[PDB]
């Protein structure tokens, strides 16, 4: 009445299955060098890996576990340029951690600096209206310098403030400079925030520094399934429930092999 034997492989017959490999699922939105194959993908079954990382320049995703659940059942992501134009900033930051052929940065973000070292960063305002019929995933970043002088050298002296405004959201953010444990040879940090922009709605970024502006916006293609595993993928076997151990193949109404398996599955016992 309850299946106890599973398949030690991920049965990908009949469904579009993408093994993200060395890239974490959230990396597809920002675009580190390891998500260049999956900046725009479509899939029915997304498979994360333990080695995959959402990040190249050390940092974190704010509200990441909620966003990962959104991305796991997205059917993929489509991109579109938000058409931002700048005058009076460097607009081409780079870091040794995000390396393609030398120093680079996130493929979908743009690190904004002052023109020269310790020069001023002018107050700017950029807007983007979601023209499509689907909600637009929109991601921005806040760079925490390692010292007060680094933030002064990069974006100029004075207090920095980033404010994000939509029809259903409005909050301001501030960088906190300080020396943090060395991750990838760096103590600075870049934190990524996100929000959903409705159709015919306009996001608005007002800032004067320490702002990792987005270049493109993401859109969800459809529906999919998202698991993390270390098992191999099987193309000839067909399954409807999956977990970290593999594939659950059963007609019994119950099972007692995993408690959080996704997909059409028997109830946990």
């Amino acid at each position, epitope marked *: 009445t309850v299946e106890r034997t599973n398949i030690p492989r991920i049965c990908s017959k009949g469904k579009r299955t993408v093994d993200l490999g060395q890239c974490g699922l959230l990396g597809t939105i920002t675009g580190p060098p390891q998500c260049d194959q999956f900046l725009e993908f479509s899939a029915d079954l997304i498979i994360e890996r333990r080695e995959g990382s959402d990040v190249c320049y050390p940092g974190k995703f704010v*509200n990441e576990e909620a966003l990962r659940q959104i991305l796991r059942e997205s059917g993929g992501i489509d991109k579109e340029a938000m058409g931002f134009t700048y005058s009076g900033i460097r607009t081409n930051g780079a870091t040794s951690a995000c390396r393609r052929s030398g120093s680079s940065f996130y493929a979908e973000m743009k690190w904004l600096l002052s023109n020269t070292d310790n020069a001023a960063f002018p107050q700017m305002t950029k807007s983007y209206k979601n023209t499509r019929k689907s909600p637009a995933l929109i991601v921005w970043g806040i760079h925490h310098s390692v010292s007060t002088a680094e933030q002064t050298k990069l974006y100029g002296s004075g207090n920095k403030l980033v404010t994000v405004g939509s029809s259903n959201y*409005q909050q301001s953010f*501030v960088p906190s400079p300080g020396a943090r444990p060395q991750v990838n040879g760096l103590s600075g940090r870049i934190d990524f925030h996100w929000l959903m922009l409705n159709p015919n709605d306009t996001v608005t970024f007002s800032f004067n520094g320490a702002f990792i502006a987005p270049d493109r916006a993401s859109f969800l293609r459809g529906k999919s399934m998202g698991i993390q595993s270390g098992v191999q993928v099987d193309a000839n076997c067909e399954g409807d429930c999956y977990h970290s151990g593999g594939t659950i193949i059963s007609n019994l109404p119950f099972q007692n092999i995993d408690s959080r398996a996704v997909g059409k599955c028997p109830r946990y016992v």
Partner: antibody
Amino acid sequence: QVQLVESGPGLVKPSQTLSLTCTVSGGSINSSHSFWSWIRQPAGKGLEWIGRIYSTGNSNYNPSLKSRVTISLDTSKNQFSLKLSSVTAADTAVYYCARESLWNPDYYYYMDVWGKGTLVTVSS
Amino acid sequence: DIVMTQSPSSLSASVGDRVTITCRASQSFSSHLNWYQQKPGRAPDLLIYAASSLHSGVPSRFSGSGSGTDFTLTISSLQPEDFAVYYCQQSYSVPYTFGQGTKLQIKR
């Protein structure tokens, strides 16, 4: 130890501009992690967030009061002020200073310093 | 604006009881909720920020549980000096909104 003190007239006449002032002790008003805010409380009712301001001068006003609300700061005096225009009988309430701490690394903000509060009746 | 419906408008509990106050959101804002204790004639003092983390200086008998849209403030072993009105605050997006408040009265 940051401390806030309200200073302003105790009553204003109808259809006039109510003006208050917050004197911040124990810390600079150019702190990189402080949104200086105003919150009012009608006697016997609940709290109503009015607006906040940053050291840069950027402000956010409550949309209901945005038409009549102006918030400014005085970096030389270590103070910030609130001016409520076209005051009606409903604006009779207790008005509080407040400092919203942005120090949290996970971006969870909170009012951790409040002024004592100053009642402002409005009447002829 | 985010409406904050806060339940138990007024209540009576004896010294030592385990009082629970609930606050419910119109959205789901990943626990951007703060709790304040306002005694008579005073400004509200911050008890709990980020739903579950205690503010430094408040006693250990104040707890905060909650996920998504439903959050609860809990006072284990209620003491007579806990008589006050408690408010929940949404810290997700301005204009910030508060609950209607909960007057906690002591039964002796």
